[PDB]
Amino acid sequence: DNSRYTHFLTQHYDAEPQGRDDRYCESIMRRRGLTSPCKDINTFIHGNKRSIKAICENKNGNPHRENLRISKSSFQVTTCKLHGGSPWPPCQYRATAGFRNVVVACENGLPVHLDQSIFR
Fold first, then answer.
1. Could you say which residues bind tRNA here?
2. Which of 15, 60, 117, 118 fits 54 for a cystine, CB–CB 3.0-4.6 Å?
3. Domain count of the chain?
């Protein structure tokens, strides 16, 4: 029903990554279609979807700033950050795994945006 939500899963969700190293990032950024031009920073959330959607309501979120939500729980996450100078592929990424709460924006109970600022 929501294309922004399906698009959120594409850009910001990976259920079970295993190794969350540089090559993890370089591969998934490609697989998820984020390399023309290279997205300069992009973060993936791991685990189940229930926990993530739940950020859109009381169960696992609170209102945050100007129309954003912040999760109550902490998530396993991997931020991929471009390097090397060029905007165009091949896109080299450096991986940073993390564990903390995340900020998103929701519509109709579904996350449609990940605030990347906190992972910078």
1. 20-21, 80, 102
2. 60
3. 1
Catalogue the active-site residues.
Answer: 12, 113
The count of residues in the chain is 120
Whether residue 100 contacts residue 70, with contact meaning beta carbons closer than 8 Å, is answered with no
Domain of 14, CATH number, reads: 3.10.130.10
- Resolution of this model in Å is 2.1
Using CA atoms, how far apart are residues 83 and 103, in angstroms rounded to an integer? Answer: 24
21 is in an annotated binding site: yes
- Give the DSSP per-residue string, 10-62: HHHB-S--S--SHHHHHHHHHHTT-BTTBPSEEEEE-S-HHHHHGGGSGGGEE
- Token digits for 68? 């954003």
Q: How far apart are CA 96 and CA 99, in angstroms?
A: 10
Range of 59's domain?
Answer: 1-120
Does the annotation flag 102 for ligand binding?
yes
Write the single-letter amino acid at 13. Y
Q: Which residues pair with residue 95 across a beta bridge?
A: 80
CA 45 to chain centre: 5
